């Protein structure tokens, strides 16, 4: 038995530990996040990624491996926790997904410009109100420099940044330096909430048309 302050801090830290640790396993699958749901006599963790048969492996062997290791590391009751690896509904708006996608395109040797606009065009065709990619480091030259690429709308100050800006940062382990990647995606107002956030950006007014009688 533990206090509630400590329980909530400990569950935040546990969330942090999974969300960080799963990055080495599901890097070459487009890891994008986990959500931990509290269910009776049972423990549910929804990993979300981009390839079920590669996250599962063969006949769900790899998710067995990971659920067992999470079981044993975080001392759950056996058969308490098991993990489903569901598909992201959309992939072009997950800043994390884009971060490791660009990380692989850029480790493959693909030219920086082609790779970065490969990210930009994909994000835009995926219906994003705006995006930028910032690369910093020693690309093709010694003295470090930043390549910043923008497109579309963008907000950076005030509350709705947390609401709309899907932002990630990743490192790249290419030889003769380290090359940092920042991906910011501004989201679009989908009041249904399936794709874009429900509440709208507070610089918008929609005067309704005067229906006539």
């Amino acid at each position: 038995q533990i206090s509630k302050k400590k329980k909530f801090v400990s569950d935040g830290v546990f969330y942090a530990e999974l969300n960080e640790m799963l990055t080495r396993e599901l890097a070459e699958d487009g890891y994008s996040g986990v959500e931990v749901r509290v269910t009776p006599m049972r423990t549910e963790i929804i990993i979300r990624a981009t390839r079920t048969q590669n996250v599962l492996g063969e006949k769900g062997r790899r998710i067995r491996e990971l659920t067992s290791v999470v079981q044993k590391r975080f001392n759950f009751l056996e058969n308490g926790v098991e993990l489903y690896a569901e598909k992201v509904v959309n992939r072009g708006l997950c800043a994390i997904a884009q971060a490791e996608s660009l990380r692989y395109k850029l480790l493959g040797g693909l030219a920086v410009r082609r790779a970065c606009y490969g990210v930009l065009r994909f994000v835009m065709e995926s219906g994003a109100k705006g995006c930028e990619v910032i690369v910093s480091g020693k690309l093709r030259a010694q003295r470090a420099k930043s390549m910043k690429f923008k497109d579309g709308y963008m907000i950076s100050s005030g509350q709705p940044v947390n609401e709309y800006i899907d932002a990630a940062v990743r490192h790249v382990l290419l030889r003769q330096g380290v090359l940092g990647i920042k991906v910011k995606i501004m989201l679009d107002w989908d009041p249904k909430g399936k794709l874009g956030p429900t509440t709208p950006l507070p610089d918008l007014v929609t005067i309704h048309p005067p229906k006539e009688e």
Binding site: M21, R24, K72
Partner: protein, 81 residues
């Protein structure tokens, strides 16, 4: 390194059943959770099995998660089965 055949057997019997194993960088515990060993063999025999890549490894920030591979199951079946 120094290992007893009984130590390496309680490693093999455990790995055959589980397939995963986690260590901790917390060193000099003399009792890994879920097995009995001074935590030096845990890190270093699976370091050897990684060097032979029977087990493929993700480091996970001094939490040392290992999940065994279908090559390593053949390795251990060549021992106990």
């Amino acid at each position: 390194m120094i290992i007893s055949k009984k130590n390496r057997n309680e490693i093999c019997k455990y790995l055959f059943q589980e397939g995963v194993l986690y260590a901790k960088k917390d060193y000099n515990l003399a009792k890994h959770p879920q097995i009995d060993v001074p935590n030096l063999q845990v890190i270093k025999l699976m370091q050897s099995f990684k060097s032979k890549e029977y087990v493929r490894e993700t480091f996970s920030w001094q939490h040392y998660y290992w999940y065994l591979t279908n090559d390593g199951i053949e390795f251990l079946r060549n021992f106990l089965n």
